[PDB]
Coordinates of C-alpha atoms and ligand atoms in Angstrom, one line a residue:
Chain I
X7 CA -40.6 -55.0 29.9
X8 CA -39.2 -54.2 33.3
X9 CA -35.8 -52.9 31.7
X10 CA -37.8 -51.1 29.4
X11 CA -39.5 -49.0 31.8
X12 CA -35.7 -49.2 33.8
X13 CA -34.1 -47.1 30.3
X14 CA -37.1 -45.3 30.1
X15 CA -37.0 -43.7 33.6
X16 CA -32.9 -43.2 33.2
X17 CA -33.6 -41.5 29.9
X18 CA -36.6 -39.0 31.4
X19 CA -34.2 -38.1 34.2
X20 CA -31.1 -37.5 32.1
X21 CA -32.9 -35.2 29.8
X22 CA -34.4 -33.5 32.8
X23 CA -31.3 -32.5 34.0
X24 CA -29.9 -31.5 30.9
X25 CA -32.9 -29.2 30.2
X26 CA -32.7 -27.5 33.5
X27 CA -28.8 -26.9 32.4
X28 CA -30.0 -25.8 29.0
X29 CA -33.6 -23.8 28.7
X30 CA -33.8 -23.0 33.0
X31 CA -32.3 -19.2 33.2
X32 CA -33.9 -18.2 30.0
X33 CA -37.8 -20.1 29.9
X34 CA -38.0 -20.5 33.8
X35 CA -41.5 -21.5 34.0
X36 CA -41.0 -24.6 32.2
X37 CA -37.1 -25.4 33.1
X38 CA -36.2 -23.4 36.2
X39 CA -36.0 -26.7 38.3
X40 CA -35.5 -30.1 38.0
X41 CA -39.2 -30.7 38.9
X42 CA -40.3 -27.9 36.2
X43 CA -38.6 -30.0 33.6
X44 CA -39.8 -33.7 34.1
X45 CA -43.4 -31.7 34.0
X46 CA -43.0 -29.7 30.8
X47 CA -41.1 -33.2 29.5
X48 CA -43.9 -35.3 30.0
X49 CA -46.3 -32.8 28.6
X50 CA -43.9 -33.0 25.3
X51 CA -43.9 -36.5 25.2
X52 CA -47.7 -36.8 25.1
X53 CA -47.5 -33.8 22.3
X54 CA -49.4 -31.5 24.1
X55 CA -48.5 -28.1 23.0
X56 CA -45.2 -28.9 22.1
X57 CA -44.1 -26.9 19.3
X58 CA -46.5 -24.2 19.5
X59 CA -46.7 -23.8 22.9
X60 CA -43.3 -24.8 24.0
X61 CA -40.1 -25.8 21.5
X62 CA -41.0 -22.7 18.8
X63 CA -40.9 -20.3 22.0
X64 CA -38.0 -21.7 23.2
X65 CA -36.0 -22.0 19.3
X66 CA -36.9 -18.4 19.2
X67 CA -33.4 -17.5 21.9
X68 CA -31.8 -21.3 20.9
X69 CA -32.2 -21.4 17.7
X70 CA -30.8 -25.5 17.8
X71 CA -33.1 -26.4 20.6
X72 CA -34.9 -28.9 17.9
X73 CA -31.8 -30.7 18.0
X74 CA -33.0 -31.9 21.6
X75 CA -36.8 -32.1 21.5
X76 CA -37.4 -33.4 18.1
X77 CA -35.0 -36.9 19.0
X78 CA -36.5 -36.7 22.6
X79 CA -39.4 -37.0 21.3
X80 CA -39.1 -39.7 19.0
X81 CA -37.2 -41.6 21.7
X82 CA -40.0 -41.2 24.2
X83 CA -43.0 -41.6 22.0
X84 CA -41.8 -44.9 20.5
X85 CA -40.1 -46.6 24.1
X86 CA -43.1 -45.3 25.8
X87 CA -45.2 -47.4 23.0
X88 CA -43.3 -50.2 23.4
X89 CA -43.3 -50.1 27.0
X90 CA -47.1 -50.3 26.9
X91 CA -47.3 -52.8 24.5
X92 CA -45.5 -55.1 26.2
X93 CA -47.4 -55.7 29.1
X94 CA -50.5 -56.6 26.1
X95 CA -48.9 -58.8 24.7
X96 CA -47.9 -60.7 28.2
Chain O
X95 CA -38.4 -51.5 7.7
X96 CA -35.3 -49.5 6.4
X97 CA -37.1 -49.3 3.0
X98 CA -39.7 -47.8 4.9
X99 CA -37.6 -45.4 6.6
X100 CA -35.8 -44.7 3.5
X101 CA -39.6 -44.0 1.8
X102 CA -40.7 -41.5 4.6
X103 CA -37.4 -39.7 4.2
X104 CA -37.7 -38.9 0.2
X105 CA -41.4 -38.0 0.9
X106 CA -40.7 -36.0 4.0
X107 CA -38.1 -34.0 1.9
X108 CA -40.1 -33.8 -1.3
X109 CA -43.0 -32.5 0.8
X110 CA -40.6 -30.3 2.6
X111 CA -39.3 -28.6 -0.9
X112 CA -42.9 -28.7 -2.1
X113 CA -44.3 -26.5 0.7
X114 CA -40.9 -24.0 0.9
X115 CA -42.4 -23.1 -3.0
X116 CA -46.3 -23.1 -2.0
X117 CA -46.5 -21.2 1.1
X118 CA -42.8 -20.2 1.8
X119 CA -43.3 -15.7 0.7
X120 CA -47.0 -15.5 2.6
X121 CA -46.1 -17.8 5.6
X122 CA -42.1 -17.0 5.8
X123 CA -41.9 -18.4 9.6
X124 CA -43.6 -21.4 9.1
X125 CA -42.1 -21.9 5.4
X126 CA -39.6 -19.2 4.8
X127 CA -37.0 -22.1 3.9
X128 CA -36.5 -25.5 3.5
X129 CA -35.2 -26.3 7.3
X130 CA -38.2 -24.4 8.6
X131 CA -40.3 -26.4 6.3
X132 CA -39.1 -30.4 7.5
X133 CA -39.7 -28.6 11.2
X134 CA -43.3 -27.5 10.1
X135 CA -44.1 -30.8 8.5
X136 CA -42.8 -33.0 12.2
X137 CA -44.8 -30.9 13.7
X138 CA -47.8 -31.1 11.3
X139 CA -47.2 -34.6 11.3
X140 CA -47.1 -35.1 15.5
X141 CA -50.8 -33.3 14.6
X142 CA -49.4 -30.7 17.3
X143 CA -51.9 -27.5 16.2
X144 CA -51.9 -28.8 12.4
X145 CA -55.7 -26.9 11.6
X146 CA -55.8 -23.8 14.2
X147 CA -52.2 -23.2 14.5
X148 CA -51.1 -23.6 10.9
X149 CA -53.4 -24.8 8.2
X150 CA -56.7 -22.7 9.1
X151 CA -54.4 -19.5 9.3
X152 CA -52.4 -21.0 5.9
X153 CA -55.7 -22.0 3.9
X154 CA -57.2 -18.1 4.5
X155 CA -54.7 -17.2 2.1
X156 CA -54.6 -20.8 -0.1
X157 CA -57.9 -21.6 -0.4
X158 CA -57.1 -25.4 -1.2
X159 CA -54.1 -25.9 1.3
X160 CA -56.1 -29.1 2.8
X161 CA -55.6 -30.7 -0.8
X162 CA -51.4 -30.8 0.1
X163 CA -51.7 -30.9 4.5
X164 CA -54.8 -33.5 4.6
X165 CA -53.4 -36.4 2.0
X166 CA -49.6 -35.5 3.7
X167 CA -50.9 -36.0 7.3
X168 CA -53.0 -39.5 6.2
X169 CA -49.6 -40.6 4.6
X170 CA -47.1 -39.8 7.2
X171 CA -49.3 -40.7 10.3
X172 CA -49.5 -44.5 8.5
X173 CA -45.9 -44.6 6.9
X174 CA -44.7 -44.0 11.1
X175 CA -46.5 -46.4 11.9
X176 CA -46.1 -48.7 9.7
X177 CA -42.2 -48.1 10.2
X178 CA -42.3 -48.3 14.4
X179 CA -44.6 -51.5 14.0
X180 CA -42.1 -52.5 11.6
X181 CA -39.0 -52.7 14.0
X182 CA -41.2 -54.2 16.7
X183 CA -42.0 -57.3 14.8
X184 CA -38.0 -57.8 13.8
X185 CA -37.7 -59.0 17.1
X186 CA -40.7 -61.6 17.7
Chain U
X322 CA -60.5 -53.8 5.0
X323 CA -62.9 -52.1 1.9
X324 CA -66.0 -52.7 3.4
X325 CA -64.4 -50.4 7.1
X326 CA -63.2 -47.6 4.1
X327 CA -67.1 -47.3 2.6
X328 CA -68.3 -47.0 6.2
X329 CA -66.3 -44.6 7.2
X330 CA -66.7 -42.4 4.3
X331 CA -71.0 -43.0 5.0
X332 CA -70.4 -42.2 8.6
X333 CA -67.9 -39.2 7.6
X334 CA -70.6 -37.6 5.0
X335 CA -73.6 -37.9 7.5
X336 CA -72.2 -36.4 10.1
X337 CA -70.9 -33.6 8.3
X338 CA -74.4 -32.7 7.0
X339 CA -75.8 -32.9 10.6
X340 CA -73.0 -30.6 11.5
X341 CA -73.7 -28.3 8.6
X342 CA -77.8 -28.2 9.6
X343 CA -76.6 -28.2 13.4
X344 CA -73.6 -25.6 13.5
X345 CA -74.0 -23.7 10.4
X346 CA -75.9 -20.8 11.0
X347 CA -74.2 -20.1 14.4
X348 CA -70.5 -21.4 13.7
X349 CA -70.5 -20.2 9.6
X350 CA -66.5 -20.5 9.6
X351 CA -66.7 -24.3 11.0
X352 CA -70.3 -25.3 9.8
X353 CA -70.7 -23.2 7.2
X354 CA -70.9 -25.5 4.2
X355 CA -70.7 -29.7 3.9
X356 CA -67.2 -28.4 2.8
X357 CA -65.8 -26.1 5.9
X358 CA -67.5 -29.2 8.3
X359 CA -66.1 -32.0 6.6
X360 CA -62.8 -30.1 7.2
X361 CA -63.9 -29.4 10.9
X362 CA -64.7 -33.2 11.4
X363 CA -61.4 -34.3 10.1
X364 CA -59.8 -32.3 12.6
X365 CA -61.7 -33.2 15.3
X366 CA -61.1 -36.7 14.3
X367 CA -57.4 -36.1 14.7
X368 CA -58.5 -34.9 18.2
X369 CA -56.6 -31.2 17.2
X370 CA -58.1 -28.5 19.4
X371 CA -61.6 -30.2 19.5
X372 CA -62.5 -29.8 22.9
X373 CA -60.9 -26.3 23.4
X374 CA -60.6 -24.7 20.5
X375 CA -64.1 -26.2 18.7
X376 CA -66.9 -28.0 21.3
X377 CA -66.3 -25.8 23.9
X378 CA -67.5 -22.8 22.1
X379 CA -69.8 -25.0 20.5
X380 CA -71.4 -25.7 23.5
X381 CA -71.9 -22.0 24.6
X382 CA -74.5 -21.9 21.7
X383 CA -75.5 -25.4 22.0
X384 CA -75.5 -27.1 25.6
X385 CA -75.6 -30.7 24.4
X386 CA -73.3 -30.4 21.0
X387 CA -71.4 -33.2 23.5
X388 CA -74.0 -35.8 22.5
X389 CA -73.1 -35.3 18.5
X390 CA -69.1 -34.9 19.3
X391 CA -68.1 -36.9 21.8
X392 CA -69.6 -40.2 20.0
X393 CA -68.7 -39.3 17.0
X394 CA -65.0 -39.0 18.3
X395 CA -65.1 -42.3 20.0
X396 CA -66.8 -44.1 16.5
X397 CA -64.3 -42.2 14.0
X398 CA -61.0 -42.6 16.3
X399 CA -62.1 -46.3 16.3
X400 CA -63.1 -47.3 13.1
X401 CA -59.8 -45.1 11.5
X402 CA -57.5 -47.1 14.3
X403 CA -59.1 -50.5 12.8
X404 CA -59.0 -49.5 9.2
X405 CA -55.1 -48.7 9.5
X406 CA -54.3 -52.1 11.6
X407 CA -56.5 -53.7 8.8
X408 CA -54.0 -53.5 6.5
X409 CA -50.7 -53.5 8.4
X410 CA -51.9 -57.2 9.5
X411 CA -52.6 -57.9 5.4
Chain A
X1411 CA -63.5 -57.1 27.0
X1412 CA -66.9 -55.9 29.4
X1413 CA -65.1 -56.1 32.5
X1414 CA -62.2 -53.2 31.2
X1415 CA -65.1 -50.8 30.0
X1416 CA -66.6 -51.9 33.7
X1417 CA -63.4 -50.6 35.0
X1418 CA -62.7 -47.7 33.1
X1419 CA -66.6 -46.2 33.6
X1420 CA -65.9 -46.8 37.7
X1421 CA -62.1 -45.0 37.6
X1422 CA -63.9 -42.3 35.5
X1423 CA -67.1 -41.6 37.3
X1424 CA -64.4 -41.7 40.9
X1425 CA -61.7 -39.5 39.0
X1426 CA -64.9 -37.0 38.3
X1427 CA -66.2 -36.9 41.6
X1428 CA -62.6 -36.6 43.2
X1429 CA -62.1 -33.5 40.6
X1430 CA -65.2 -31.7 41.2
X1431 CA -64.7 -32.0 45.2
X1432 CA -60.6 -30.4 44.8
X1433 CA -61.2 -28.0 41.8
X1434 CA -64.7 -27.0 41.5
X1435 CA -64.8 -23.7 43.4
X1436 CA -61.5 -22.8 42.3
X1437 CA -61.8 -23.7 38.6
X1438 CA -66.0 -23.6 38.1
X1439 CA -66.4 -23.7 34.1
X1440 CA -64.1 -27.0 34.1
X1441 CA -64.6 -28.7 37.1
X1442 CA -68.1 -26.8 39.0
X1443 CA -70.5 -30.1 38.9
X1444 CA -69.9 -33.5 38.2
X1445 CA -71.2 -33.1 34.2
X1446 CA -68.3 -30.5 33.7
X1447 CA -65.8 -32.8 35.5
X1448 CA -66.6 -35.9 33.1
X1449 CA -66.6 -33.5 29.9
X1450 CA -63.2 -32.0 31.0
X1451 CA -62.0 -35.5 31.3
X1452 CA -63.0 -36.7 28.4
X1453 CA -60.7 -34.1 26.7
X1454 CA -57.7 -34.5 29.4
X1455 CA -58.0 -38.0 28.2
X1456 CA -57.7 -37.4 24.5
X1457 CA -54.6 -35.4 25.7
X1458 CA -56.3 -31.7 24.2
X1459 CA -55.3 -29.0 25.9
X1460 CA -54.4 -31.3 29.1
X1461 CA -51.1 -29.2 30.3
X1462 CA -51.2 -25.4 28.8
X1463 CA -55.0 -25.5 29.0
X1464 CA -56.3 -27.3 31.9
X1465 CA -53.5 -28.6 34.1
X1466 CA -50.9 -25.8 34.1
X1467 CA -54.0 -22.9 34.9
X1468 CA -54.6 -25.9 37.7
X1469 CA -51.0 -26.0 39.5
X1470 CA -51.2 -21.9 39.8
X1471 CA -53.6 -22.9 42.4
X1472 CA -53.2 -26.5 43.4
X1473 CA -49.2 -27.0 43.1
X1474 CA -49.7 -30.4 43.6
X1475 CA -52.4 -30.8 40.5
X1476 CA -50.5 -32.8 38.5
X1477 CA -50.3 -36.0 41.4
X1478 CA -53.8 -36.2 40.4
X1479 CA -53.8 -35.6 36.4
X1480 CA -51.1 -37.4 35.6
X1481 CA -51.1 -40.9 36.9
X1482 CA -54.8 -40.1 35.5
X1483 CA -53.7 -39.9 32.3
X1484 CA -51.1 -42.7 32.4
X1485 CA -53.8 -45.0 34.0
X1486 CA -56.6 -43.8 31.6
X1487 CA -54.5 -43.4 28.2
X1488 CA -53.4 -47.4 28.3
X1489 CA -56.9 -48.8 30.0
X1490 CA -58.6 -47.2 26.5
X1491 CA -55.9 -49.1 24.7
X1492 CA -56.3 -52.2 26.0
X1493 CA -60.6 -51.9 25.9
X1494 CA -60.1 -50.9 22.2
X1495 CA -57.3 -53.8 21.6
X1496 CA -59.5 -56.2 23.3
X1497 CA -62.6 -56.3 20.7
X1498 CA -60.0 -56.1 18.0
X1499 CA -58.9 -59.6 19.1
X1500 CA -61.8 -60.8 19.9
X1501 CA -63.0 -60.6 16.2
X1502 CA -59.2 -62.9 15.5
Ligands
2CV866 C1 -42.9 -39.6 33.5 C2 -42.6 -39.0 34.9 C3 -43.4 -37.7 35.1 C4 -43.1 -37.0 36.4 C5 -43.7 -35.7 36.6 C6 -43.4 -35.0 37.9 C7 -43.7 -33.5 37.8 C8 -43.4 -32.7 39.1 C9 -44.0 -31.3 39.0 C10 -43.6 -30.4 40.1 O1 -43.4 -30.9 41.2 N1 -43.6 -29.1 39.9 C11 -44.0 -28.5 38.6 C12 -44.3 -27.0 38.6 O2 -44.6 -26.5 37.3 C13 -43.1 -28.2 41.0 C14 -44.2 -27.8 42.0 O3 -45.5 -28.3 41.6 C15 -43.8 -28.4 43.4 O4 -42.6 -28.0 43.8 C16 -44.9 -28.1 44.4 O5 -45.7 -29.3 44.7 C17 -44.4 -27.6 45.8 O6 -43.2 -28.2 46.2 C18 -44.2 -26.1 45.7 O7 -45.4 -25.4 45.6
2CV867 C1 -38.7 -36.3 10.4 C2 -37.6 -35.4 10.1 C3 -37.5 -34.2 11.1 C4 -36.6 -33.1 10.6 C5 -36.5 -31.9 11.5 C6 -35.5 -30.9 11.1 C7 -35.6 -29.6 11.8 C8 -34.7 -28.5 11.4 C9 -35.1 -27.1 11.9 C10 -34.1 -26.0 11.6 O1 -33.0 -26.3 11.1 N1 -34.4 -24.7 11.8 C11 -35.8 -24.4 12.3 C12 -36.1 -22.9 12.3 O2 -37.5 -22.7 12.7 C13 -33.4 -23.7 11.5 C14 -32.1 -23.8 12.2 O3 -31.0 -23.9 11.3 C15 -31.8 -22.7 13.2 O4 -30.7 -23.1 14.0 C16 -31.6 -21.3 12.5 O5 -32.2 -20.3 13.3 C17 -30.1 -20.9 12.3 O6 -30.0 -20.1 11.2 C18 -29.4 -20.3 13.5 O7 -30.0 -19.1 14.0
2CV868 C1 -31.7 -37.6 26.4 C2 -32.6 -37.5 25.2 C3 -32.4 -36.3 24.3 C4 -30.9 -36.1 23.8 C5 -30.7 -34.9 22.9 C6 -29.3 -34.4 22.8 C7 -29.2 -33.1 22.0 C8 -28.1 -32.2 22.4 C9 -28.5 -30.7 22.4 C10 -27.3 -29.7 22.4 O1 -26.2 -30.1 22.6 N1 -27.6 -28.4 22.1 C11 -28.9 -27.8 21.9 C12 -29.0 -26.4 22.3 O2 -30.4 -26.0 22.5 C13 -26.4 -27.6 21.8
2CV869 C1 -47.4 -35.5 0.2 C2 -48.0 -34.2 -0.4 C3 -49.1 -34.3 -1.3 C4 -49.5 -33.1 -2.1 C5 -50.7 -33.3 -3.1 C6 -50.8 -32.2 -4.2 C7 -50.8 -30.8 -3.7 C8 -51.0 -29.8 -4.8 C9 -50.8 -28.3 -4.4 C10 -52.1 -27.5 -4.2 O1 -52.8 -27.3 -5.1 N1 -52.3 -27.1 -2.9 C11 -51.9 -25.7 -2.6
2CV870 C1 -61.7 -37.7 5.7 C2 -62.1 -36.8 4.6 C3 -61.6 -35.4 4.7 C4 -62.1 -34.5 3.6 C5 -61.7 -33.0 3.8 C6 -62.2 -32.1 2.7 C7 -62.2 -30.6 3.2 C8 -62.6 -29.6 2.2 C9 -62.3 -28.2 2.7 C10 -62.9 -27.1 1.8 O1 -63.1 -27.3 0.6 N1 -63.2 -25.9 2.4 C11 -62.9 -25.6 3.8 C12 -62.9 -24.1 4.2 O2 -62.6 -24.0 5.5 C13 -63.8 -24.9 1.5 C14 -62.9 -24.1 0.6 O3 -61.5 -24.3 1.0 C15 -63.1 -24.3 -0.9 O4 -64.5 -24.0 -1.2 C16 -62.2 -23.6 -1.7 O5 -61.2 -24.5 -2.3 C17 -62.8 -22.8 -2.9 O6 -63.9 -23.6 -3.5 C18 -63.3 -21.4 -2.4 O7 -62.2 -20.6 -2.2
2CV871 C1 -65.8 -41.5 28.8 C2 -67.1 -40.9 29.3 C3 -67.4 -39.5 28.7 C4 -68.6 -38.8 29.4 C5 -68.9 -37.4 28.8 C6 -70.1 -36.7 29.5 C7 -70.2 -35.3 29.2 C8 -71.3 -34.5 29.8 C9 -71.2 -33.0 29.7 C10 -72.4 -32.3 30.3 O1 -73.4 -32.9 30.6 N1 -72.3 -30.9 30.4 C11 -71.0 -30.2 30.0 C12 -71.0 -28.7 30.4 O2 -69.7 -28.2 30.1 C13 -73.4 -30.2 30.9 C14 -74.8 -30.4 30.2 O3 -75.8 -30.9 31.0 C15 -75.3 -29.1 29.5 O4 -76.3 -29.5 28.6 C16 -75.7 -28.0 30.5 O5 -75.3 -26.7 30.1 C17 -77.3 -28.0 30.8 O6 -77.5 -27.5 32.1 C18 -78.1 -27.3 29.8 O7 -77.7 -25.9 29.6
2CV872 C1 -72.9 -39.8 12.8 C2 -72.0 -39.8 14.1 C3 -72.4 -38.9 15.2 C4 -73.8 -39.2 15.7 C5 -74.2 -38.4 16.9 C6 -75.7 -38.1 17.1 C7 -76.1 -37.1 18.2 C8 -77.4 -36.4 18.0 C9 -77.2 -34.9 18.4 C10 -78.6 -34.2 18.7 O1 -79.6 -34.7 18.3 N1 -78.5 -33.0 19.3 C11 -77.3 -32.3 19.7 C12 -77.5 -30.8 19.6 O2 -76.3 -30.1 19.6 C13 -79.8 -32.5 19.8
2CV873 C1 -57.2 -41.7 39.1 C2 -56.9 -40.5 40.0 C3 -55.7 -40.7 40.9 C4 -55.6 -39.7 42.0 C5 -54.3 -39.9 42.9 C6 -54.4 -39.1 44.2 C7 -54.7 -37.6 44.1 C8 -54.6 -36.9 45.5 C9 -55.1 -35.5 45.5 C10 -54.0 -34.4 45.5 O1 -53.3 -34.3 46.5 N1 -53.9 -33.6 44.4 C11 -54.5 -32.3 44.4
BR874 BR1 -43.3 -39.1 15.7
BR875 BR1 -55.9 -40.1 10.2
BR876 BR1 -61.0 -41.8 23.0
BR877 BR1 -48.3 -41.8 28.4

C-alpha cells in the first residue's frame, strides 16, 4: 500500500514536470510552473473540468495532447483507486 | 478481465462509428470524425460535462439523443468498472 | 439485486414528479415535463453540473430546493453504487 | 459504521466554520455564513465545479487556497467511501 502511494507520488511528479516542459509557454495559467501543474493535474485526476475546461483548450494548439492526458488519466484514476482501497481492505 | 477489455473496446468503437453518422454534419467538433468521436465518448464516459456541455446542446437539435448517450453512459460506467474490479481481484 | 432495481425506478419516478410540480413553472427547460426532469434527475444523479450549473440557480427561485436535491443525491448515488456492486459480487 | 458519520459531520461542520472565517468576505455568495459554507462543501465534495468554479476564483485571492481544499477533498472523498462501504458490509 505504501509502494503504491511511493509510484503514485513518482508518477504525479514526473508528469508534472513534463507538462511544465510541454503546455507551460503556451497555457501558462495552468502549466507555467511546476507548482501550476501538480494543481491543474490533480484537478484532472479527480475529472473536474478536464476536457472542457482544460485538455480541448489545450488540443486546440497541440493537437496530440490526448496522447498525455487521456493515459494519465487512466493511470491516476485507477492507482489512486487502488491506493484507497487498500487501506479498506487492511 | 481481457474479455472484458476486449468487450468495451468493440462497443467503444461501434459507439464511436455510430455517433460519427448521428451527429457528426450538425456537431462537426464534437463528431466531425471518427477520432473526434472515441475522444467525445472518454470524455462522455469520465461524465466530464456529458448533459450541459454536450448532450443538452446535441439533443436541441436530436430530440431523442438521450435514447444513444443515457443507455451508452450506464454501459460504459459498469463495463469500467467491472474491468478495473476485474484486475484487482487477479491478484487476491 | 431486482428488488434495489424496482426501488430505484419508484424512487426515480417520484421525484421526478415533485420536480416537475416543484421546478416546472419556473425552470420549464429542466422541469418542464416528467420527461425534461427525469432527464434533469439523471444528470444530477451523475453529479454533472448539479450544484453549479442546476441547484444553484434553483435556489435563486427557491431558497430550500437543497432539502429536495441534496437527499435525493445522497439516496440515488447510494442505492445506484449498491445496485452495481450487487451484481459484480453475483 | 456511526462513529465515521460521527467523524465526517464534526470535520464538516470545522471545515465550514474554518471556510466561512478565511473566505466569507472575500467570496460572500459561496462562503458568507456558515449555511453557504456547508452547501458549497457539499458540492466541492461531490468534486462539481471544485477547481474552475470554486477553488481557482479562490487562489486569485488566497494563493494558498488550495492547502485548505485539497487535503479537504482527499480526507472527505475517502471518509464518504469508507461510511458508505461500511453499511454495505455490515449487511455481509
Ligand atoms: C496529489 C498532490 C497534489 C499537490 C498540489 C499542490 C499544488 C500547489 C499549487 C500552487 O502552489 N500554486 C498554484 C497556482 O495556480 C502556486 C501558488 O499558489 C503559490 O506559488 C503561492 O502559494 C505563492 O507561492 C505565490 O503567491
Ligand atoms: C477508451 C478509448 C479512448 C480513445 C481516445 C482516442 C482519442 C483520439 C483523439 C484524436 O485523435 N483527435 C481528437 C481531435 O479532437 C484527432 C487527432 O488526430 C489530432 O491530432 C488532429 O487534430 C490531427 O489531425 C493533427 O492536427
Ligand atoms: C507520466 C504519465 C503520462 C505519460 C504520457 C506520455 C505521453 C507523451 C506525450 C508526447 O510525447 N507528446 C504529446 C504532445 O502534446 C508529443
Ligand atoms: C451503446 C449505444 C446504444 C445506442 C442505442 C440506440 C440508439 C439509436 C439512435 C437514436 O435514435 N438516437 C439518435
Ligand atoms: C434513470 C432513468 C433515466 C430516464 C431518462 C429519460 C429522459 C427522457 C428525456 C426526454 O424525453 N426529453 C427531455 C428534453 O430535455 C423530452 C424530449 O426529448 C422528447 O419529448 C422528444 O423525444 C420528443 O417527444 C419531442 O421532440
Ligand atoms: C454533508 C452535509 C450537507 C449539508 C448541506 C446543508 C446545506 C444548507 C444550505 C442553506 O441552508 N442555504 C444555502 C444558501 O446558498 C441557506 C438557506 O437557509 C436558504 O434557505 C436561505 O436563502 C434562507 O435565508 C431563505 O432565503
Ligand atoms: C424522493 C427523493 C427526494 C425527497 C426529498 C424531499 C424534500 C422535500 C422538499 C420540500 O418540501 N420543499 C423544497 C422546496 O424547494 C419545500
Ligand atoms: C479539513 C481542512 C484542512 C485545513 C488545513 C489547514 C488550512 C490552513 C488555512 C490556510 O492557510 N489556507 C488559506
Ligand atoms: Br476512466
Ligand atoms: Br449511472
Ligand atoms: Br455524496
Ligand atoms: Br482523490
Amino acid at each position: 500500500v505504501g509502494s503504491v502511494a511511493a509510484l503514485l507520488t513518482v508518477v504525479f511528479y514526473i508528469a508534472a514536470v513534463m507538462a511544465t516542459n510541454l503546455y507551460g509557454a503556451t497555457f501558462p495559467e495552468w502549466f507555467g510552473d511546476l507548482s501550476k501543474s501538480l494543481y491543474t493535474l490533480f484537478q484532472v485526476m479527480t475529472l473536474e473540468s478536464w476536457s472542457m475546461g482544460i485538455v480541448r483548450p489545450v488540443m486546440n494548439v497541440h493537437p496530440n495532447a490526448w496522447v498525455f492526458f487521456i493515459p494519465f488519466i487512466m493511470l491516476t484514476t485507477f492507482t489512486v483507486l487502488n491506493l484507497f482501497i487498500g487501506i479498506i481492505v487492511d
